[PDB]
Design an enzyme around this catalytic site. Sequence first.
Site, mmCIF file in Angstrom:
data_model
loop_
_atom_site.group_PDB
_atom_site.id
_atom_site.type_symbol
_atom_site.label_atom_id
_atom_site.label_comp_id
_atom_site.label_asym_id
_atom_site.label_seq_id
_atom_site.Cartn_x
_atom_site.Cartn_y
_atom_site.Cartn_z
ATOM 1 C CB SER A 33 2.305 5.990 8.937
ATOM 2 O OG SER A 33 2.645 5.379 10.518
ATOM 3 C CE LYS A 36 1.179 5.191 4.608
ATOM 4 N NZ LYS A 36 2.720 5.806 5.900
ATOM 5 C CB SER A 94 5.151 3.393 6.125
ATOM 6 O OG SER A 94 3.667 3.930 6.603
ATOM 7 C CE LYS A 211 1.535 0.671 7.187
ATOM 8 N NZ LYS A 211 2.711 1.062 7.407
HETATM 9 NA NA NA Z 1 6.134 2.684 10.873
#
Ligand code: NA
Length: 260
Positions: A33, A36, A94, A211
């Site tokens: 992820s 993203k 997320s 992130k």
């Molecule tokens: Na995460």
Amino acid sequence: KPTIAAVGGYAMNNGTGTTLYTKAADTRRSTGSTTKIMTAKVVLAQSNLNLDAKVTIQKAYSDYVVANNASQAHLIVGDKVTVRQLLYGLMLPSGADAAYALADKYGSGSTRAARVKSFIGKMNTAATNLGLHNTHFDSFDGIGNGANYSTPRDLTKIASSAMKNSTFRTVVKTKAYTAKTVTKTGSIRTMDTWKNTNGLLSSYSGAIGVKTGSGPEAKYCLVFAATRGGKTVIGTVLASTSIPARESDATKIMNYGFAL
Ligand code: NA
């Protein structure tokens, strides 16, 4: 040099571009992820970008998170959500449902399927444009095939490039956000509060981003950034071993970078 659990690590002076830390910095691995970050980047780079543009949450977004048991922002089908709100849903909790809503909105095509393919095409173009050689995307959320990879150096460079956008920086440093959405019947809905998954924002003074990321093959990842004394350090940790260890690896590397 600090010892970290992660198998891939990198950090640099965001301002100068001078490498500060290295550990298998150019070995490709799965991103999960952390992907993203690029979705946000591509969105914010659209010429037809309008942060106040509303998007209707489609049943497809919802079914997607379910079919993949992915992380989500709890978007309600039928609700009208602004592009700006989707950016908070993408980066704080997320939200894979939000990532889908963005791909579908900014991709080019006559069908949702055509537009997400075009969007992922854009993600890969933005990488080539950055002069990257070890990054490839197969999804808009990082939950798509083993053809979704990067390295600690490429990803850091992608983050540094996104941190150049002020809206990106505003979002990524936000600890909590409550979306006020418009409902199917035109009423205002107060959604449950979204809390940022990045613990450094509370545990590390000067932390400004960027992130977290995880996945079956990517394990626990984190792209961090902190500024102290006018000097900002930005880096990435790939495949650490736990949520706590990911934040630790990052903390050790940043403390090292600031004292160098
Ligand atoms: Na995460």
